[PDB]
Symmetry: D2
Subunit: 323 residues, 4 copies
């Protein structure tokens, strides 16, 4: 996975969902009066409305990523081997990873509010159901001002400020940021010939500034290439142009089918790519085999409802036969 | 600035068009009886029908790339500083670069027939007009059996068999192919720990087999990355799944706006991407700010016509509002 | 700097000393009855004899690296920006970095003994003298069984087991080890063509397995290249052949003059390279402008002495005119 | 397997000899009146005196590299799979590779005189003997003014001006030079943060300007690394300081035993390194297991002699026991 923030005029939030198998992903709107029952903390009978992509395998909104009606977003990204979920700790707010998105997004408007919430958190090892055990995750949260990373590992729970608004998979966030230091020299412009003033070296291609940028599908490579691509991105401020640029940043680090064998000839690939407009409450997506962007606008629903509002994803190619 | 071939069940041909300015690109169908008048060779009054993208700045089809009704495709790619066009040579077929796609695709059904034609070619330095002078180019041609590269440089005219079905920009094709030798180790599978059997190295990420693949936007890096991506691609044989994979290979080496500064704060970016089904005569495309695939089927036109059939490109984002 | 361990039959320990200026380095033997007066801990009036390289600028042995007569070695390596020395802490053994080598090597025979010693350590910010303030360091310690790294940073004091027997400069040791994970694929043997079974790639050179090994002079690059070079090293077990291999591992990551500008046209370069035989008590060195190995054997001195025994370094080239 | 030129005040020429087996390498001085009998060209009964390293397996001087008394040097380097030696061609000077160093150095004082000679050359496939068949090679020649490369391949005989004064193994020299273009950015100074002005990247190490330089033992990587090292070298003008720097450039790309497995657990390693002072006629060398520099001065022999003057190499470690 790769999650990013972007700002044009509005602020956007989204991610590539990379995996080798697809669990009936759906677009789910959780309206305000859908009661959240939590295993070990107080219930939220009334809360902020949420829209995101969820696993359509349960009668409860099992979000992979989502935004709320106040412009706060959250995404869980694979952290296999690194994530560590705890036993119940008296005096903490004991929240399972499966509940975590609803817990934050239901009651926080801003990253600053979530930071307050997160001081008393303990992420506990409680499965949604017996058939649907917990996945090892870490999290990106963002709003119109900033982003944070939440990692629960063997060492404990850490919350990081995220200066680049990017996240991928392993290893821990401190290492990802540090590694950026190695790529200081990368540029959008052609370099001078620093190698020697005694010889002429030819500028035989455009794009030479970026030489050294990693193009493989591993976690750290993708972090570096998505961060470069995001921070050097230019687009106009119109909504369609801004989401176009955003999906181009996500494309830059998508996983093509065939390229990442995870064993037994199964392939990790970019099942879907999302872009959420935090001001407008619009969840945009593309899927591996549907290039057209599809938009679901949470504000078009009745957010006073008490039941999930579920949209199947348009997963097959929508061609414009012009002619 | 990347052209490729791909085979699933049907065979496909297409390209990214990367440049810093967009000159009224249109989809042009040249029907069979549109007379081709050539500056220094015999005219083609009747010829094979052609579909491609052309510069919509002239009343002659100035193709950037195209396919004909017999399943032969051809594309011109920037080769600045490398291309050399010649004086007229008595005893050669003297064809200008602006005429070259009509010349080959009007009369050849296969790459083998083009190879016969190319033995007598001399690419000549004659402009379409003073207002529209020649661009430095090289070409990829491909059919359902194979692909070749055509380069006219200071050293002369060379035609290469293309064992990977990819082409980018500079330098010459022999160097591009040679450079692939440096990447033998790259894999879709996790490597063994060859580094040392005396220590344990952790597999902390998927996709580690690709470490080393270059992710910058320069010519040679994109060549390597598109080749690796193409050759290791997997998809089902259905038309929509096949073209989806094709566009994903082109996306792997597209150029995002902002990342390649060419001066005067102008940026080289991927203005459009095409995929052509050689068996079906369908030209599919996506543009920088329209992610939906748009299809133009040459076979829906009257190919016995006399005049060019010109379609504007769908350039703004075609969004599926699903609620 | 780069410090390493190596084993053939005997166990060796040594380092490159890389800096931009040379402080009258000398080979100093500290015999058993040279009283060590410590600023804040108990004195060592009698202790193990030590041989190493020291700054010949003071009447006290200011070791850059040394071994003792029991086969325990220690080296300090630049850690600028990372090292943090503390205030005096009641209940700790408060030892200044300038005293640290004498403190450990004077009283420990083995790394296990030093680990015991190090549990109560606090490295304190006390200068040797007013003219000779403390340098930011971290440390490698080794004996015939194992090696450890000692880092005192803002976070605190950490002692790491060192599975590869290498150290360089920044950043912290955990990051260096982690980074090795990225180089799992590197090999002494030619790789298979994993890139594609559809094309022939030519083995045009020997040594292709190692492609990806970094060759720059930065700290992390040197760590990776010295670790690869050490762990894949082969030599015979004879003393001269074993030290030859050891100096070849150090050469692999030396800093040539001119290549590392540190500002004002001053250059960080490998002032000297050492190799110490832990069993025999022999300190071998080469300097930048003397390629011949020079050997100082501590066991040839009277180790019951009470005064430093000081050898100037042979710093100019010793040529054998044969023829 | 790396040859270089270097200038301080005097001019120097020399090489690493990298191979997996050592065949009685000796230092051979060919005096002026040692008759050269050539297989297919006129004999040189009187010629310039030559000093170099030769295979001590024949009563003819089979040089790996050498210089003559007029300050012209020449070296043959492995070019396996690339070299092509020819049938005898009437009207050419037909010279076998085993004769080629005598042929040029016996009669030419300068690279310009060699260029005149080489216009009529045809390198012929004639073995010294059945027991000692030809090796595939290419050559670097150099004097106090310039250097050139000579390659005989399937395509023919080519002579290139060498703008960097380096040569390694495969592939052809035009590709080696071209590849340098990819390294324009590399610097001896710390880079600016070009990556993004929106974030702070820490300069955690010296030598970050070189990041990207390749550190593996393959041909092309060593070419790049030796070129960067050579061109950015600094030293004083004194003979001992100059040769010290020279040997440091060769050390930057030497091959440590164990790191290049060529099969049958045989290893390609740097058997010897030479540096020749062209003005003085001195051959200096180091060997894998002798780090001390050994000098052989051709001018101390009687150059009017008739017979080869042969010195065994000092191959075991010459240690300075300083106590």
């Amino acid at each position: 996975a790769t999650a990013i923030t972007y700002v044009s005029k509005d602020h956007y939030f989204g991610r590539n969902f990379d995996y080798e198998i697809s669990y009936n992903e759906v677009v789910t709107i959780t309206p305000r009066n859908y009661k959240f029952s939590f295993r070990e903390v107080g219930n939220l009978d009334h809360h902020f409305a949420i829209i995101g992509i969820a696993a359509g395998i349960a009668d409860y909104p099992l979000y992979y990523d989502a935004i709320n009606e106040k412009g706060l977003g959250m995404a869980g990204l694979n952290f296999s081997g690194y994530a560590d979920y705890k036993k119940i700790e008296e005096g903490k707010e004991n929240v399972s990873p499966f509940e975590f998105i609803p817990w934050v997004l239901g009651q926080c408007s801003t990253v600053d509010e979530a930071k307050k919430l997160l001081k008393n958190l303990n992420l506990v090892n409680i499965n949604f159901s017996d058939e649907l055990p917990l996945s090892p995750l870490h999290w990106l949260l963002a709003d119109k001002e900033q982003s944070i990373v939440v990692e629960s590992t063997k060492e404990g729970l850490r919350v990081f400020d995220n200066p680049v608004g990017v996240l991928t998979n392993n290893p821990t966030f401190d290492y990802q940021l540090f590694n950026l230091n190695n790529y200081r020299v990368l540029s959008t412009r052609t370099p001078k010939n620093n190698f020697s003033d005694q010889i002429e070296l030819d500028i035989y291609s455009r794009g030479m500034g970026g030489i050294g940028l990693p193009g493989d599908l591993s976690s750290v490579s993708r972090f570096v290439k998505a961060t470069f691509t995001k921070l050097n991105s230019v687009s106009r401020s119109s909504e369609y142009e801004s989401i176009s640029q955003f999906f181009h940043i996500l494309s830059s680090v998508e996983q093509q089918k065939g390229l990442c064998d995870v064993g037994d000839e199964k392939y990790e690939y970019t099942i879907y790519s999302s872009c959420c407009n935090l001001e407008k409450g619009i969840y945009y997506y593309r899927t591996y085999d549907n290039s057209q962007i599809t938009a679901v606008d949470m504000n078009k629903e009745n957010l006073e409802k008490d039941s999930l509002i579920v949209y199947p994803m348009v997963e097959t190619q929508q061609i414009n036969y012009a002619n």
